[PDB]
PDB file of C-alpha atoms in Angstrom:
ATOM      1  CA  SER A1091     100.511 125.837 110.878  1.00  0.00           C
ATOM      2  CA  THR A1092     100.989 122.145 109.965  1.00  0.00           C
ATOM      3  CA  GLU A1093      97.503 120.631 110.476  1.00  0.00           C
ATOM      4  CA  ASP A1094      97.769 118.846 107.122  1.00  0.00           C
ATOM      5  CA  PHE A1095     101.507 118.081 106.682  1.00  0.00           C
ATOM      6  CA  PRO A1096     103.268 115.763 106.992  1.00  0.00           C
ATOM      7  CA  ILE A1097     100.276 113.734 108.215  1.00  0.00           C
ATOM      8  CA  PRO A1098      97.005 114.720 106.452  1.00  0.00           C
ATOM      9  CA  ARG A1099      94.421 116.236 108.812  1.00  0.00           C
ATOM     10  CA  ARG A1100      91.901 113.558 107.699  1.00  0.00           C
ATOM     11  CA  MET A1101      94.248 110.794 108.949  1.00  0.00           C
ATOM     12  CA  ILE A1102      94.709 112.667 112.257  1.00  0.00           C
ATOM     13  CA  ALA A1103      90.922 112.696 112.678  1.00  0.00           C
ATOM     14  CA  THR A1104      89.792 109.313 111.304  1.00  0.00           C
ATOM     15  CA  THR A1105      87.868 106.977 113.632  1.00  0.00           C
ATOM     16  CA  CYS A1106      88.519 104.108 111.225  1.00  0.00           C
ATOM     17  CA  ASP A1107      90.965 101.330 112.011  1.00  0.00           C
ATOM     18  CA  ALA A1108      93.878 100.300 109.750  1.00  0.00           C
ATOM     19  CA  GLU A1109      91.965  97.560 107.937  1.00  0.00           C
ATOM     20  CA  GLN A1110      88.897  99.721 107.283  1.00  0.00           C
ATOM     21  CA  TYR A1111      91.127 102.390 105.751  1.00  0.00           C
ATOM     22  CA  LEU A1112      93.081  99.864 103.707  1.00  0.00           C
ATOM     23  CA  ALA A1113      89.901  98.261 102.331  1.00  0.00           C
ATOM     24  CA  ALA A1114      88.556 101.710 101.433  1.00  0.00           C
ATOM     25  CA  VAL A1115      91.750 102.449  99.450  1.00  0.00           C
ATOM     26  CA  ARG A1116      91.606  98.989  97.801  1.00  0.00           C
ATOM     27  CA  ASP A1117      88.172 100.022  96.462  1.00  0.00           C
ATOM     28  CA  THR A1118      88.650 103.796  95.853  1.00  0.00           C
ATOM     29  CA  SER A1119      92.326 103.919  94.686  1.00  0.00           C
ATOM     30  CA  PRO A1120      92.985 100.290  93.578  1.00  0.00           C
ATOM     31  CA  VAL A1121      96.284 100.986  91.819  1.00  0.00           C
ATOM     32  CA  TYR A1122      97.689 102.755  94.887  1.00  0.00           C
ATOM     33  CA  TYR A1123      96.561  99.835  97.070  1.00  0.00           C
ATOM     34  CA  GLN A1124      98.035  97.245  94.697  1.00  0.00           C
ATOM     35  CA  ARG A1125     101.373  99.072  94.395  1.00  0.00           C
ATOM     36  CA  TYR A1126     101.639  99.422  98.194  1.00  0.00           C
ATOM     37  CA  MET A1127     100.909  95.706  98.615  1.00  0.00           C
ATOM     38  CA  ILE A1128     103.558  94.844  96.021  1.00  0.00           C
ATOM     39  CA  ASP A1129     106.082  96.914  98.080  1.00  0.00           C
ATOM     40  CA  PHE A1130     104.777  95.301 101.328  1.00  0.00           C
ATOM     41  CA  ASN A1131     105.173  91.834  99.754  1.00  0.00           C
ATOM     42  CA  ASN A1132     108.764  92.717  98.666  1.00  0.00           C
ATOM     43  CA  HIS A1133     109.618  93.461 102.358  1.00  0.00           C
ATOM     44  CA  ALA A1134     108.596  90.158 103.942  1.00  0.00           C
ATOM     45  CA  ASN A1135     110.762  90.571 107.012  1.00  0.00           C
ATOM     46  CA  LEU A1136     109.215  93.975 107.879  1.00  0.00           C
ATOM     47  CA  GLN A1137     105.550  93.003 107.388  1.00  0.00           C
ATOM     48  CA  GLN A1138     104.621  92.304 110.994  1.00  0.00           C
ATOM     49  CA  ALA A1139     106.446  95.412 112.245  1.00  0.00           C
ATOM     50  CA  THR A1140     104.533  97.466 109.645  1.00  0.00           C
ATOM     51  CA  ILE A1141     101.160  95.955 110.651  1.00  0.00           C
ATOM     52  CA  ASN A1142     102.048  96.599 114.308  1.00  0.00           C
ATOM     53  CA  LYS A1143     102.944 100.217 113.572  1.00  0.00           C
ATOM     54  CA  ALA A1144      99.737 100.791 111.602  1.00  0.00           C
ATOM     55  CA  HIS A1145      97.759  99.321 114.527  1.00  0.00           C
ATOM     56  CA  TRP A1146      99.584 101.555 116.995  1.00  0.00           C
ATOM     57  CA  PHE A1147      98.938 104.686 114.902  1.00  0.00           C
ATOM     58  CA  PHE A1148      95.256 103.916 114.558  1.00  0.00           C
ATOM     59  CA  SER A1149      95.078 103.214 118.325  1.00  0.00           C
ATOM     60  CA  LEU A1150      96.315 106.752 119.045  1.00  0.00           C
ATOM     61  CA  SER A1151      94.041 109.639 119.919  1.00  0.00           C
ATOM     62  CA  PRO A1152      94.112 112.534 117.413  1.00  0.00           C
ATOM     63  CA  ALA A1153      96.292 114.495 119.884  1.00  0.00           C
ATOM     64  CA  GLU A1154      98.795 111.623 120.012  1.00  0.00           C
ATOM     65  CA  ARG A1155      98.783 111.458 116.203  1.00  0.00           C
ATOM     66  CA  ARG A1156      99.459 115.218 116.106  1.00  0.00           C
ATOM     67  CA  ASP A1157     102.452 114.674 118.386  1.00  0.00           C
ATOM     68  CA  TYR A1158     103.653 111.822 116.151  1.00  0.00           C
ATOM     69  CA  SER A1159     103.224 114.131 113.115  1.00  0.00           C
ATOM     70  CA  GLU A1160     105.345 116.805 114.807  1.00  0.00           C
ATOM     71  CA  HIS A1161     108.124 114.158 115.137  1.00  0.00           C
ATOM     72  CA  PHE A1162     107.501 112.247 111.894  1.00  0.00           C
ATOM     73  CA  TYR A1163     110.748 113.129 110.088  1.00  0.00           C
ATOM     74  CA  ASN A1164     113.021 111.957 112.970  1.00  0.00           C
ATOM     75  CA  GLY A1165     112.428 108.349 111.824  1.00  0.00           C
ATOM     76  CA  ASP A1166     112.521 104.965 113.595  1.00  0.00           C
ATOM     77  CA  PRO A1167     114.234 101.725 112.368  1.00  0.00           C
ATOM     78  CA  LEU A1168     111.320 100.956 110.004  1.00  0.00           C
ATOM     79  CA  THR A1169     111.721 104.350 108.361  1.00  0.00           C
ATOM     80  CA  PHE A1170     115.360 103.626 107.375  1.00  0.00           C
ATOM     81  CA  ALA A1171     114.771  99.943 106.422  1.00  0.00           C
ATOM     82  CA  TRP A1172     111.657 100.692 104.317  1.00  0.00           C
ATOM     83  CA  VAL A1173     111.069 104.383 103.656  1.00  0.00           C
ATOM     84  CA  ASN A1174     107.602 103.864 102.137  1.00  0.00           C
ATOM     85  CA  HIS A1175     106.192 101.506 104.827  1.00  0.00           C
ATOM     86  CA  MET A1176     103.436 104.038 105.717  1.00  0.00           C
ATOM     87  CA  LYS A1177     103.033 105.452 102.181  1.00  0.00           C
ATOM     88  CA  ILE A1178      99.413 104.341 101.747  1.00  0.00           C
ATOM     89  CA  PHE A1179      98.359 106.116 104.974  1.00  0.00           C
ATOM     90  CA  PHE A1180     100.192 109.452 104.740  1.00  0.00           C
ATOM     91  CA  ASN A1181     101.643 110.284 101.345  1.00  0.00           C
ATOM     92  CA  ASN A1182      98.763 111.155  99.020  1.00  0.00           C
ATOM     93  CA  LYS A1183      96.103 113.613 100.171  1.00  0.00           C
ATOM     94  CA  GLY A1184      93.689 112.630  97.395  1.00  0.00           C
ATOM     95  CA  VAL A1185      93.984 108.917  98.205  1.00  0.00           C
ATOM     96  CA  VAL A1186      93.568 109.695 101.909  1.00  0.00           C
ATOM     97  CA  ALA A1187      90.490 111.851 101.286  1.00  0.00           C
ATOM     98  CA  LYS A1188      88.702 109.191  99.220  1.00  0.00           C
ATOM     99  CA  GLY A1189      89.598 106.434 101.736  1.00  0.00           C
ATOM    100  CA  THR A1190      88.656 108.344 104.898  1.00  0.00           C
ATOM    101  CA  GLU A1191      85.382 109.456 103.281  1.00  0.00           C
ATOM    102  CA  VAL A1192      84.088 105.857 103.154  1.00  0.00           C
ATOM    103  CA  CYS A1193      86.191 103.718 105.532  1.00  0.00           C
ATOM    104  CA  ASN A1194      83.575 103.811 108.337  1.00  0.00           C
ATOM    105  CA  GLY A1195      81.433 101.563 106.070  1.00  0.00           C
ATOM    106  CA  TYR A1196      84.059  98.742 105.889  1.00  0.00           C
ATOM    107  CA  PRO A1197      84.592  95.829 108.380  1.00  0.00           C
ATOM    108  CA  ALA A1198      86.801  96.588 111.355  1.00  0.00           C
ATOM    109  CA  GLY A1199      89.784  94.307 111.934  1.00  0.00           C
ATOM    110  CA  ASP A1200      89.666  92.528 108.542  1.00  0.00           C
ATOM    111  CA  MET A1201      93.252  91.244 108.317  1.00  0.00           C
ATOM    112  CA  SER A1202      92.724  89.719 104.840  1.00  0.00           C
ATOM    113  CA  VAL A1203      93.371  93.210 103.393  1.00  0.00           C
ATOM    114  CA  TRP A1204      97.082  92.701 104.229  1.00  0.00           C
ATOM    115  CA  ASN A1205      97.131  89.472 102.167  1.00  0.00           C
ATOM    116  CA  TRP A1206      97.218  90.280  98.452  1.00  0.00           C
ATOM    117  CA  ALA A1207      99.525  87.696  96.902  1.00  0.00           C
ATOM    118  CA  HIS A1208     100.859  89.611  93.872  1.00  0.00           C
TER     119      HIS A1208
END
């Protein structure tokens, strides 16, 4: 009864890693990617925590992500310090769909996707 909200079902199921997904969005929804990276850049002190959290999420089994989704609104310190820290992964179903459709074709672990100096 909430397979697709708050966390989109395609993000629950993806076998892609963070950097494959991010690169896919960079190419399929460039404005969304750019605007996220601007917000990321504006939160310098929270960047590593955000990268770490993305890595954790993508390390999780689908069942673990479902659990996380069932507890998403509770919030952790990152959620209060930077509400939109996971916006690129979770917030837009259309962006998610286009990214998860193609992310398996991108290079795993490519950390340069977190470095967009704008």
